[PDB]
C-alpha cells in the first residue's frame, strides 16, 4: 500500500536488499560453489507473503 | 441432531438486543426522604419516542433537593401528559394523572401504572402501551394492598410501593393490521433477532423435533411436559387445554 | 493582501517603522504602490501622477524600491 | 470540458470529503475542499434558532470577536427574546402572588 507502518516499511526495504546476486569477486574464490543465489524472488513470480 | 433455534437463542450471539439508539432506562427516581415524607415537583421538558417500545417517554426534569443542579429523569408517559406540565412525586402528592404516589394512598378503584413489585425498585408492572393496573383493596393491618395486573392476575404488594396514576400512552397500537412483510421487518429494528420464523415441520429431523418425512406433519403430540430438556421442549408446554376456546 | 483606500493611511504607513520593501507598478491606466510590510502587502491604486510623485518622495531612501513595468524583473 | 481529480488521498464522497470545482488560469479547473453546513444555537426552552449568531463550526466561534458570539440581553445567547420575557413575568408575578396570598395575607 501507499500507507505503511515504519517497521513494516523497513522489512520491505530489507527484502529489496536481499534480492541481489553473488558479486563477481566472490565467485572467483578458491573452492567456490556459490554462483547463484537460490533464495532470489521476483515480484511477479513468488509473493513474499508479508 | 443439531442444536435447535431456541437453544442458539440463549448464547448472546446475533440474537442480542438491538439497543443502540434507545433513550435509556425508564423508571421512577430513587426513593429518598423528600419522596417518603414530602413531594418533589418535576417539569415535563419534552415527550420523546424510544425505539423498540410502543410508549412515548417523558424527559422529566426535577431539582436536586440536597445539592445544586438538576435531576434529569426519564419516565414512561401517562396518557394526557403534555410539555410544560408539573408532576409531583411523593407521599403527599395530589391524586392527579401523572403524579407518582405510593400505592397505599390511592383510593380503591384507582387506575395506576408503572407499579413497583417491591418498594424502591423503580417500576415493574403495567408498562406496555395502554396498559394499567387497578387497585382492589387495602390492608392496613400488615401494610399491604391488592392490585389487579393487566393479565388479570391479582397481586399483593406493600402499601408503600410507588406508582404513577393513569394510563400508559400509546394505547391501541396492536389493533392496526400489519399488511406487508416489509412492515413487520421494520418492527424489529430496535428489538431482538426473531422475525422470519421457519416452521419446524419444514425443517429436517436433525434441526428440529418436528422435522418430518414424506408428508409435512408432526407425528407426536405437541403438548409436552414442563420437565422436558432444552432441545426437545418445542410446541405447547404444560398445556392444560388445547383447541379453539369457547 | 489588503488595500489602502485614501492618501492619509499610506503616508502614515510609510512613516511607520514596520515597513520592509516597496514596489511600484505602472499600469496602462493606474499606478499601484504595494508596500511590503511584515504581515500583509498593502497597496494603493493611484491615477493622478502628481499624487504619485508626492508618494515617490515619501518613500524613505534606505528602502529597496522595485520598479515594475511591462517586463517583470 | 476539463475533468478533475481528488487532491487529497480520500476517494469517497463522504460528508467531510466535499469538493468544489473552480476555474483557474488558462481554463484549468482545480479542486477546493468545501466546509460542512452547521446549525446555530436554539432557545433553551422553546428550541428556536436564535437571531444574531452565525451558523459556523464550534471552534470558529472562538476566532469571532467577543461581541459576535452572543446577544446583549439577559441570558443573551441561550434564550430567545420571547423566552426571556416569560422568565421575567414568571419571576415577578409569582413572587408578588406569594407576597399577598401568604406572608401577611
Amino acid at each position: 500500500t501507499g500507507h505503511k507502518g515504519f517497521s513494516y516499511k523497513l522489512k520491505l526495504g530489507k527484502k529489496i536488499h536481499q534480492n541481489r546476486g553473488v558479486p563477481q569477486w566472490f565467485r572467483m574464490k578458491t573452492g567456490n560453489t556459490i554462483n547463484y543465489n537460490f533464495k532470489r524472488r521476483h515480484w511477479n513470480r513468488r509473493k513474499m507473503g508479508m | 441432531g443439531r442444536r435447535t433455534l431456541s437453544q442458539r437463542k440463549g448464547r448472546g450471539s446475533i440474537f442480542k438486543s438491538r439497543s443502540h439508539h434507545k433513550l435509556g432506562v425508564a423508571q421512577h427516581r430513587a426513593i429518598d426522604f423528600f419522596e417518603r415524607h414530602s413531594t418533589v415537583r418535576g417539569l415535563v421538558k419534552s415527550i420523546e419516542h424510544d425505539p423498540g417500545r410502543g410508549a412515548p417517554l417523558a424527559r422529566v426534569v426535577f431539582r436536586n433537593p440536597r445539592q445544586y443542579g438538576l435531576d434529569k429523569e426519564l419516565f414512561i408517559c401517562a396518557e394526557g401528559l403534555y410539555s410544560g406540565q408539573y408532576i409531583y412525586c411523593g407521599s403527599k402528592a395530589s391524586l392527579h394523572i401523572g403524579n407518582v404516589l405510593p400505592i397505599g394512598q390511592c383510593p380503591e378503584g384507582t387506575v395506576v401504572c408503572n407499579v413497583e413489585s417491591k418498594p424502591g425498585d423503580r417500576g415493574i408492572i403495567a408498562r406496555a402501551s395502554g396498559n394499567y393496573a387497578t387497585v382492589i383493596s387495602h390492608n392496613a393491618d400488615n401494610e399491604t394492598t391488592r392490585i389487579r395486573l393487566p393479565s388479570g392476575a391479582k397481586k399483593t404488594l406493600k402499601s408503600n410501593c410507588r406508582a404513577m396514576v393513569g394510563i400508559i400512552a400509546g394505547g391501541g397500537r396492536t389493533e392496526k393490521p400489519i399488511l406487508k412483510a416489509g412492515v413487520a421487518y421494520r418492527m424489529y429494528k430496535a428489538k431482538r433477532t426473531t422475525w422470519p420464523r421457519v416452521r419446524g415441520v419444514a425443517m429436517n429431523p436433525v434441526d428440529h423435533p418436528h422435522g418430518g418425512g414424506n408428508h409435512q406433519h408432526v407425528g407426536h403430540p405437541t403438548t409436552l411436559k414442563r420437565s422436558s430438556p432444552p432441545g426437545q421442549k418445542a410446541g405447547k408446554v404444560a398445556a392444560r387445554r388445547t383447541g379453539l376456546i369457547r | 493582501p489588503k488595500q489602502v483606500q485614501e492618501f492619509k493611511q499610506i503616508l502614515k504607513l510609510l512613516k511607520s517603522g514596520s515597513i520592509r520593501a516597496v514596489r511600484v507598478k505602472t499600469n496602462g491606466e493606474n499606478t499601484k504602490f504595494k508596500v511590503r510590510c511584515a504581515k500583509y502587502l498593502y497597496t494603493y491604486i493611484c491615477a493622478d501622477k502628481a499624487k504619485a510623485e508626492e508618494l515617490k518622495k515619501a518613500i524613505p531612501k534606505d528602502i529597496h524600491v522595485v520598479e515594475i513595468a511591462k517586463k517583470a524583473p | 470540458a476539463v475533468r478533475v481529480t481528488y487532491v487529497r488521498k480520500h476517494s469517497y464522497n463522504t460528508k467531510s470529503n466535499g469538493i468544489r470545482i473552480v476555474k483557474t488560469a488558462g481554463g484549468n479547473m482545480t479542486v477546493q475542499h468545501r466546509q460542512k453546513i452547521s446549525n446555530g444555537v436554539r432557545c433553551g426552552d422553546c428550541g428556536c434558532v436564535l437571531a444574531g449568531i452565525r451558523h459556523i463550526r464550534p471552534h470558529q466561534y472562538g476566532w469571532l470577536g467577543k461581541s459576535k458570539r452572543t446577544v446583549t440581553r439577559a441570558y443573551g445567547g441561550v434564550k430567545c427574546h420571547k423566552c426571556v420575557q416569560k422568565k421575567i413575568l414568571r419571576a415577578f408575578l409569582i413572587n408578588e402572588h406569594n407576597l399577598i396570598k401568604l406572608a401577611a395575607a
Partner: protein, 72 residues
C-alpha cells in the same frame, strides 16, 4: 462460483507479522498469535507437534549468552 470467481475479493489480511516469534501468525481479530501464542507468557508448544518443537526451540538461534555459560 465457489472456485475461481469467489477468490476475487481476497484482499483483507487475517494474520500479520507477530512480535515475539516473527512469523505471519498474529490473528488480528482474535488478538493472538497462532504459532508462539503471544499475550501468553509461555511459548506455545504441543507434544503432538513434535516437528514444530524442533523448528523453534533452544539451539535453533544465536545462543548469544548461553553458549558462553555452558562452555564456562
Amino acid at each position: 462460483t465457489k472456485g475461481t470467481s469467489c477468490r476475487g475479493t481476497r484482499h483483507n489480511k487475517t494474520h500479520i507479522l507477530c512480535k515475539r516469534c516473527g512469523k505471519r501468525s498474529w490473528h488480528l481479530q482474535k488478538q493472538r498469535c497462532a504459532s508462539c501464542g503471544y499475550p501468553d507468557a509461555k511459548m506455545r508448544q504441543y507434544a503432538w507437534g513434535y516437528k514444530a518443537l524442533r523448528r523453534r526451540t533452544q539451539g535453533t538461534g544465536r545462543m548469544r549468552h548461553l553458549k558462553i555459560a555452558l562452555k564456562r
